[PDB]
Structure formats: C-alpha cells, structure tokens
C-alpha cells in the first residue's frame, strides 16, 4: 500500500492495491500422439540403390 500510493505514510481506510507478488512458473509442452511416420525405414535400409 505504501509504495502503490507513493508515500511513506498511510491514512486510515481500506485501499485497493495491485499485485506485485510474483511466483515462479514452470513450463509444460503438450502435443498429440506421434503418428504418421515416413518410409525412411525402407528408404535408408532399402535393398538396392
């Protein structure tokens, strides 16, 4: 309240403040099931080039 009002002294009353309290945030990444795989198996391990 003191800094949000830009003063070292605070009068009586109920002030509405901001939200300075930060919190550490982890990261998550989600993608669908891996499907639709190329023919690389038969391209690299092909019988004859």
């Amino acid at each position: 309240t003191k800094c949000t009002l830009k003063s070292f002294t605070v009068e009586k009353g109920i002030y509405q403040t901001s939200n300075f309290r930060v919190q550490p945030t982890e990261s998550i990444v989600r993608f669908p099931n891996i499907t639709n795989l190329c023919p690389f198996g038969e391209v690299f391990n092909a019988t004859r080039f």
Binding site: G13, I14, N19
Partner: protein, 187 residues
C-alpha cells in the same frame, strides 16, 4: 495454443470434434490434453483482488488483508502462499481468518457486537482498531432498535425543545488551472 495459468480438473463435456474451449471474447477457457482425452480448466494464476485495511500509520502499523470472493482454504493456493515471503504467510493462514460473503478477511478479530461502521469492508462487515488494541471486524449496526408504543388513541407530544446548529459544507469552486499546451508538450 500457448498461455499461462493453472490447470485444474474440469466439469465440462466437450464435443468429440472440439479441442479448445473458448469464452465470448475468443479466449481459451478449457482445453483437451492432446494425449489424454481429459478436459482441463485454465484458471489464470494472479490475484489483484486484494484490499489492505489500515488505520493511519500515525496510530498503528497493524493491517488487515481482504481477498475477494474466496474460501479460507483456497487462499494459500489462490495467491500461492507457498512461494511467498514468510512474513506474507502470516496473512494467508492463522487464527484471525473470517469468511465474509465478500471473501477471506485476515488479520481482523471477528467480534459479535455491532457498532457504527468505521472502515467499510463489504457485505455488511466493517473493521476498526479497538481495544491491548487490535483490528476487529463486525457486522455494522444500522442504529439502535426501537419500538413505538402505537395505539389508536395515544399520542406523544413534546414538552421541551432544543435549538440545534448543524454544519453543512459544500464546495463551490475549483482551482482555475491553465496549461500551456505547446510548452508542456514541446518545451
């Protein structure tokens, strides 16, 4: 889609072909996990609905905190009390923890006696600094109750009187400000 928030078990029933929920402002509300066919509600992790009740720093430095529309068990998870300074964890749990219809009030001693409102909190609850001294929260009083001894053949007539001088203050004028536009913008 990408975003920031808290993922919680949802209650909705997404259609078989819908993936991402959406509010009326084209904003993500719930999502379907790409691997597990479960719907997760995304509640943003930030609380700005926090009010600080304080008596004047001249009188004391004790304060109370009001969190808007929360239960008293959801407070250390709504504001993430576990990742806060330990001096903020005083004002997230404890013994002075009232549950008003407006939210969670912390640091105010809940009393039963009603008094004239001093610092309005909300939903009929007002707080004040009183006696050794501490902050108290109470259902504000609307005035001392009374009963009129009314009957069809009884009248109350005054016999004395008082000349009362009351004071009504009304603002009349402001300060005649003047701004030099070009000097202010382009001095």
């Amino acid at each position: 889609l990408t975003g920031t928030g808290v993922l919680t078990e949802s209650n909705k029933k997404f259609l078989p072909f819908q993936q991402f929920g959406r509010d009326i402002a084209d904003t993500t509300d719930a999502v379907r996990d790409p691997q597990t066919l479960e719907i997760l509600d995304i509640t943003p992790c930030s609380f700005g609905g926090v009010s600080v009740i304080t008596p004047g720093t001249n009188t004391s430095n004790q304060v109370a905190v009001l969190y808007q529309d929360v239960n008293c068990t959801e407070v250390p998870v709504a504001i993430h009390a576990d990742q806060l300074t330990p001096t903020w964890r005083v004002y997230s749990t404890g013994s002075n923890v009232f549950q008003t219809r407006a939210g969670c009030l912390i640091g105010a001693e809940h009393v039963n006696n009603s008094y004239e409102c001093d610092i309005p909190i909300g939903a009929g609850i007002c707080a004040s600094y009183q006696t050794s001294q501490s902050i108290i929260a109470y259902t504000m009083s609307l005035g001392a109750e009374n009963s009129v001894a009314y009957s069809n053949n009884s009248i109350a007539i005054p016999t004395n009187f008082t000349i009362s001088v009351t004071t009504e203050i009304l603002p009349v004028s402001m300060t005649k400000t003047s701004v030099d536009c070009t000097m202010y913008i382009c001095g």
